[PDB]
Each structure stands twice: as structure tokens, then as C-alpha cells.
């Protein structure tokens, strides 16, 4: 049907072929165990002979050691298949989501994708394993038991097998029809209960107008209708079982009536009747398990199709082929507008903004909607529809994905730290290029010994996942340390602390150093340090500009800059 | 534990006995059916003689009649017990539900209370029925199958039942310990998958720094770790199975080792071993059902105790016994700043305003003041905390709730009509002394001849519960429906909604003139159309007392009355 899981089992296709011995043997041992009962009937207890009985219990012990070893190794084999194939699937999808655009796990909706990977992937694995072991073991069981039945009495065989479908269809249709009879009037029972609900929910009017006796009488009547409904519920539910069991018993009656009614029949050992009846008693469980194998297979395959439509989605397409060394050109935001999923409003209206190199330009806003997307989206995450971000004679899309992300670093209160040494966390990706000496120099500039480097280790200690939980401001500090190590050309910072400025007031922007004098940067306005340190503030609120003058010129009069100043004190 | 069901079972206690007498036979049917095996094998074809093989199918049918008929009868009897005991439980709980205070509906329980009285009633019924079948059918099927030893095993199968508890304790302890072994690594599985959580939640950061390949390597290692963890996971459950199968195999081996001594085996023939083994096969299901009977006994019966809490929850108590035929007196409020139970919200006004009977007055409010709650204090749906509301020289609590029920009326958009005809709907309970003549003269100045009350079954048109869907504005009022028959002195006019109903808005003012000739009644002015026909404009609004103002003093300046005019219009 959907055989895309067949290539990925190719490197491990030999698992099932190796398991084949176990797949046949699991059922072969039980079938043979049932076969050995015939000697226990006649060759054993049926006569004074007990030569077989000398060792038969040793045979059943030994054959189930074979059964247990086959079960253990079959489980080990499907484990080796399942863990390896889900490992490869995880490898592929991990590389895919890091290749995916702004979508389900980026800005669209919750991060329940890991729930999908952690639950439904192993659900698919367990489903495939259960389906394979079930189909193979039960097929072997049916074939072995049919072999035994033919080998013992072919006439009794065929008469029992032709008896089987009649009872099967009888029980199936009577169960279905009586279930329908139950439901089509269970709905009426639900209707009566929901009618009683309104009587209950009308407690106000009865409590004021006064209807205790009459309302109780009404409920008594409706409850009596419910009582008759319950009577008929139990009658319908309890009349299916007697008919079902009646047909089940009549199967035994039919086979025994056919048994020995001709003189030629019952020419058998006369003990084999017991073992074939025991085989019928035994096979019911595997038969009931054999009904839902195709539905389970296709449900698991539907889950796999969910994981596969997660797979083979379009990745970050970037056809630009302008390799980047260092972009000193200006960043232009001229009447640009990108797209935001789930928002019919245009994500960014016409905006005019230029940030020459070495100029500290600070943007200000109040609502916040649009504040992040103006400066945090110069990395070309969201698709820009019309307008151009000029980058040294080339647009944003014309530059290949290289340097930092394309050209720019970022810092915010959401910087998720990885479990590699914090030194390599700040030398992430480009670990080989930068030595450890310049890494500890970057830490020297970070100037945070009391938090990160105080002989917890030299520098090799890591902030463990949900472990140490070092401070958010401090993780911002080592993030900008990472940025200065990688020599960030342009920098984005959110400044979402609004809390105690314990030593971060010194290193509010990379210790107020070459990252500010050179390497122009944007600041989201939350602190007056950013306000007083600005070259030409572009006032932006709700995706539009209201002022574009010099901050100090806007400070003399009110305008709009002074208003946002008023509240931001 | 809680023997409160037994008093109600007492008027139908014979039902359970007549169910059990049938279920004992039903259980014994299977035991006797198994007992027929010894005649079948050795007395029958084992000796190679006709014997009574022509009877055994007929015996099967003749015992399954006593299976099926008694199954149906026992089901009918337990249904008789259940459908009556639940009926009286629902009657009693309804009696002690609408008769207890109103705060339970208000935020203490949502609409799921139907499931508290509907679905849990069936839950207690189903659990009682389950306990009855599982103590009588199982519990007498067990004794029926247990007596096979006395009929057969004088010395032959006592070793089997001595062996059984060893099997039970061994399989239980090994299963529990291996369950613990399997479960004490799910924490590590969660640890590694949460590390993966952090990894893919850092997709923003790694996309800034483009380290997708080194991240993929990190995930390669962690994914291999959890792959080995899954290997050990499934290995634990795999190696659980042969250990528990070993106990059954050694049980069979021990049985046959005991059978290796002919000095006891001289007197079994051949089929008795078969019937003993069949009894073992039939013994698996009833014990597995018997394990959970003590839990199932207190599964829903604990829920029955939960319902008993509502049953014995106190009703609205009113020790006052002051009755009144027609309360032509003032209702005087004094410093009532009550807070309704369940939440300490900002309170209402320190009310000191008196409404006199024979001196009409209308109340105007604004912005969810809880002024509707003030109306409840005329009806005492809610409790009064401080202050006092007095009625004709007597306090609120001094009167019987029936008396104020008769005196006070209410008008609102939300009135839960009932499953009856409209004529008795307007005569909800007090209909015996009010015949159809006083229905139709009320209809005469109802002026609702056909607006929504069109002649379908005459003026006493049959009202369908939740199906008629009539307009709430003209569903309930003194002439439109009721309170004219009771000639209610005090009445509420909610005036919640203001739609463009045709002439029904005029009909509201018509009913206003037909009412306010006498029977002074305040209103809640969602719209300010009724304040024109108001002798005094009491201007208290919001959560505090503002003043007791008249029509003229507040009109000259902004104040509140003219303000509420400005915002509304």
C-alpha cells in the first residue's frame, strides 16, 4: 500500500530472515506440545504402557525451553529492527526540522512535535512489531493445527471445518443486529435523560413559583420511563449472550452427533477426540487476535504516514549564490512587508529605515506587536514578499546561507543553551576554527567570573539541561560573549530583563566596547541606557513610523518620542 | 463498608435472592457439562461401545436450556433490582437537590452534575450487578469446579491443588519484580527524551549559528543512547515471558512426575486426567475475575458515597413561620453589603434605599453591578451577610419561604419551561383551584394571542421541551404567563435583552401599564426605556452607594443619571 518503509529496513532486512527460525518455532513447539497429548491419552494412561510417560514431561520442559529461547531471540530481533529503524527515522526528521522554514515548531503553534516523535514513532514501531509477530505466529499456529487435524482424522477434520463458518456467520450477524437494536433505543434513553436535565436545570422557576410536589411527580414519571428503558436495555443486552452460547453449544452437539453415528466413524484411537477438542479450545484466543491485524497494520501505517508528511516537506529554499566574507554595506528597510501566518493584517506596513555602519540606531515601541519582527527578522526567516533589503548591491534572498546565519547574530532572554562545554557553547559550530585561548579571552570580555568561571571548572563545566539553571541575564551575557568571539558584524538585542541590573549595567552591550563604537546594532527599547545612547531613533509603533528625527531634536518638543519616554521612566 | 444501600434494597431484597438461585444453576451448568466428559470418553468411545452417546448431545441441550433461561431470568431480576434502586436513589437525591441552596449551581458545579446523578447512578448499578454476578456465578462456579476432587480425587489430584498456590505466589512475585525492573528505567528514557526536547527547542539558536551538523552529531549520540535504552526496555518484557511460562511447564511436569507412581494411578482409567486438565483450563478465567472483586465492590460504591454526600447535604432551612396572604407593605433595605458565598468579589452598595408598596419605583444600574443579586435578596435565593431586609415590620428570615414564594414574582429573559402544555405551564403547580377560565382571562390581557403563541392545539398549545424555541421576552410574565393568577405584590423586571421584536417591545410597555397600576416592582434597566415610566429614579450603581436621588436633582448636572443617559444614548 505505502511501502516507503521498505527502503529504510533494507540495511536491516536480514533481521526477519534471521528471526524466521523463531517465528516458525514459537508456534511449532505449542502445536507439538498439543500433539504429545495424544500419547498421554491412549499410548499412556489409556493402557498399562507408560514407556512414553518416562520422558514426556522432559519433552514438554525441553520444548518450551525452545519456545522461550525463540521468544527471547524473536523479541531481540524485532528490537534490533525497531530501534535501528526508528533511530534512522529520527536521524532523517531531526535533519529535516532544522531544514524546515518558519512553521509548526518555529512560530505557528505549540511545540507538541516532540510529543509526536516520542509517542507515535515508537507506536509505529510497536505496531509493526506486533503485526509481524502476530501474523507470523498465528499463521504458523493455524497451519500446524490444520496439519495435526488432517494427520489425525480427515473426516472429522473436514466436518469440523465446514461446521465452523456457519457458527461464525451466525454469531457475527446476531451480535451486529442486537447491537443495533441496543443503540437505536439507547439514543431514546439518552433523550429521556437530557429531557430530565432541563427539569433539573429549571430549578429557578420551581424554587420561586413553587412546584415541589408536581415537579417531583414529573421526575417520578420520567424516571419510570427510564426504568422501563433500563429493563429493555438489560433484556436486549442479556438476550444476545444466550443465543451466542446456544450456537456455540450446538456446534459441540453437531460434531458429537456426527461423531460415531456411522459405524465406520469412531474407528480412531478414541483419545484424539480429546486433543482435537482441546485444540479448538486453544485456538480461540489467536483467532480473536487474528481479526484486527489488518486494521492495526493500517492504523500504524497511518501514524507512519503522519510522520512521513512531517517528512519530505519543503526545506529552507535559498537559491542565492553570493558567498559572503564580511558585509559592511548598509541594511535598508524601505517600504517592506513580510507575511505572518494566521494574521490577515499585513505583518509590516510601509517602513523607511537605514542603519549605516558604526551608527547606533535605537528603535522604540509600546505595543510590542511588530517590535520584534522589524529587527529580529533581518536573518530572512520569514519570507519577504515585496521590498528589498539591500546588502552590498544584492538583495537578502541573493545571499547564500553562510557566515553567522546569513550575516548577523542575536541575543535575547530566550537563548536555549546546549549540553556541550559552555566554552564550545560559545564556540558552537566553529569550534575548530577558534582556539581555547581566544575562547577564554572572550570570557574575559564577558566579565562574569562570579557566575560562569569561579573554579566550577577551568571553563569546561556545562549548564545542564534542566540542571544548574544559570540566570537568564547571565545567559544573555555569555551569548553576547559568543557574539564578540564570532565577531558579530551587526547585533540584535531585545533587553527583556526589566529587573535588577546586577553587573549587567556594566556589560549592557558587550561592556560598551567596539561592538558599539563599530559593528552597528539595533536595540528594543526597555531601558534608558538604550534611549540616551542612540544616533537617530526611528519611532515605530503598530508597523508604521510617526517620527524619524534625531532623538535630541525630538526631546526638545513632545512629538511621539517624548510620550513613549513619559511612560517608560 | 457503607450499608446505606441495604435499607433501599429491603423493599426488593427478594430480587437478589431470586437472581442468585438462578445464577447458581447457571454456574453449575458449566461444571456439569465438564463432568459429562468422563461418560463421554471412557464410558463411551473409549470402551468402544454405543453406551449413551445418543444422549450426551441431548444432555448438552437439556443443560443449556437451564443455562440460557436462567441467564435471562437472572439478568431480568438484577435489572429489576437495579432499575428500582436507582429510581429511588434519583427520587431521593432530586428531593434533596432542588430543595438545597442555589450557590451550588453558581460556580460550585457546572452542567456535568447530570453525569453526577445520571452516569454515576448507572455506575453504582453496574458495579452492584458486577459484584452480584462475580460473587454468585463466580464463587459458586468455583465451588462447583472445586468439588471435582471429592468426586474423583481421593488421593490423585490433591497434589495438584497443593501445587497451585506455589504457582500463584511465584508468578506474582516474579511478575511484580520484573515490572519494577522495567519501570525503573522509564525515568532515564524521559531524561534522554527531554534532552532531545531541549535540543530541538534550541532550533532558533542553532539556526542563528547554523550548527545543524554538530547538533545532528549530538543527536546521533543521544539517539543511540535511547536506542540501547529501548533495547533494554523490550528485553525486560521479553525475558519476563519465559520465566512465567516456566512455572506452568514445571507445574505440568510435577503433575506427571506424581503420575509416574502407578500405586495411585491404578484407578483413573483415561478420561479423568482429561477432565482434571479441562477443569484447570476452565479455572483461569474465574480466578482472574475473582482477583478484582473487592476493588470493584468499592469502585462505584465509593462513587455511591459521593452521591450520598449530595443526598445528605443540608436543604434550605427557614425557621420563620410568618405567612401572609397579600404583602401590601414596604420592603426596607438597611446596610446590606453582602458578599455571595464562594468568592470575595468587590462588593455592592451599602444599600439603605426602601421600596414602598403602593409607591412605584424603578432601579437603574450599569456595568454588571450584580443588581440582579439584589433581586435575589427579595426572594432569598442567596444568603444575607450583614444589614437587613425587612418586610412589613418583620425581617427577611421571619417569613416562611412559601409565603414569599407566593408574594414575590420574577420576570427575566431566561425561564426554563417544562414538558407540558402552556395552560398548565402558566399554572405550574397551583392548577387545581385555577381552572381554564382563569387561564383564558389571563390570556385576554396577555396580548399574546398569536405572536409566538399561535393556535396549534388551541390556547392550551402543547409546549415542547427544548423543541418549541419561543422568544424569551414574551414567554413569561404576569399575563403573558403567570403571577396574575397569584396577583403577586412584589415582582422583578430584569429587562436583560433589547431586540427589535415586532410590537412585542410595545407589548412590554402595555404589560407595564397593566402591572404598575398596583404591585410596586423595581426593574433592572439594561436599557433606559422604563425609567420614563418611573416615579423615582434611584441612582445607585456600580459597586458602591452613590446617593438616593430623584428625577430632578440629578438631571440638571452630569451626576450619574444624566451620565447613564449620555453613555446609553
Swiss-Prot record, chains A, B:
Gene3D superfamilies: ABC transporter type 1, transmembrane domain, P-loop containing nucleotide triphosphate hydrolases. One of its GO terms (biological process) is lipid transport. Residues 16-299 form the ABC transmembrane type-1 domain. ATPase activity is stimulated by lipid A, hexaacylated lipid A or Kdo(2)-lipid A. Inhibited by the phosphate analog vanadate. It is found in: Cell inner membrane. Changing residue 501 to G: Loss of ATPase activity; ATP is still bound. The chain crosses the membrane at residues 52-72, 129-151, 156-175, 242-262, 264-284. SMART domains: AAA. It comes from the Bacteria. Signal peptide: none annotated. Coiled coil: none annotated. Residues 331-567 form the ABC transporter domain. Its main location: membrane. Changing residue 201 to A: Does not reduce substrate binding or nucleotide binding, but decreases ATP-dependent extrusion of substrates. ATP binds at residues 365-372. Changing residue 197 to Q: Improves basal ATPase activity and increases transport activity. Its EC number is 7.5.2.6. Keywords: ATP-binding, Cell inner membrane, Cell membrane, Lipid transport, Membrane, Nucleotide-binding, Translocase, Transmembrane, Transmembrane helix, Transport. It is an enzyme of class 7 (translocase). In MsbA the ATP-binding domain (NBD) and the transmembrane domain (TMD) are fused. Substrate binding induces conformational changes, NBD dimerization, and stabilizes an inward-facing closed pre-translocation state that binds ATP. ATP binding fuels a relative motion of the NBD domains. The movement of the NBDs is coupled to reorientation of the chamber, which binds the lipid substrate, from cytoplasmic-facing to periplasmic-facing through large amplitude motion on either side of the transporter. ATP hydrolysis is then required to resolve the outward-facing conformation back to an inward-facing conformation. Belongs to the ABC transporter superfamily. Lipid exporter (TC 3.A.1.106) family. Involved in lipopolysaccharide (LPS) biosynthesis. Translocates lipid A-core from the inner to the outer leaflet of the inner membrane. Transmembrane domains (TMD) form a pore in the inner membrane and the ATP-binding domain (NBD) is responsible for energy generation. Shows ATPase activity. May transport glycerophospholipids. In proteoliposomes, mediates the ATP-dependent flipping of a variety of phospholipid and glycolipid derivatives. May also function as a multidrug transporter. In addition to ATP hydrolysis, may utilize another major energy currency in the cell by coupling substrate transport to a transmembrane electrochemical proton gradient. In vitro, MsbA-mediated ethidium efflux is dependent on both the electrochemical proton gradient and ATP hydrolysis. Identified as a drug target. Inhibited by a series of quinoline compounds that kill E.coli through inhibition of ATPase and transport activity of MsbA. This is ATP-dependent lipid A-core flippase. It comes from Escherichia coli (strain K12).
